[PDB]
Amino acid sequence: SMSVKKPKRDDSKDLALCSMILTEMETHEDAWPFLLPVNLKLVPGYKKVIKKPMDFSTIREKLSSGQYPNLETFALDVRLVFDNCETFNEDDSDIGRAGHNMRKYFEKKWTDTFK
Hints:
By secondary structure, this protein is mainly α. Helix content is 57%, strand content 0%.
């Protein structure tokens, strides 16, 4: 509360560490469904169904330009990529499986880096 603060967690490396995590996600072989925005003209249903489209390149630009106020807002956009994927793709599809693999991969890096 007022004039009463928990001890200050060092957050000064968070930007660099999110960037490295994101680099690792970008270079994973199963990243291909997530590298770019889903083409809303060419994929029937996507525009109407997925209220908040997200992809790695868009996370990368937000990161580079100071649009994440903290590391949790960054984790939300990453998870949004996978939650969208699960919304639109059957689990037993190459893209569906990619999404499950990439979420697992992200979550481990997140824990090992920050928890």
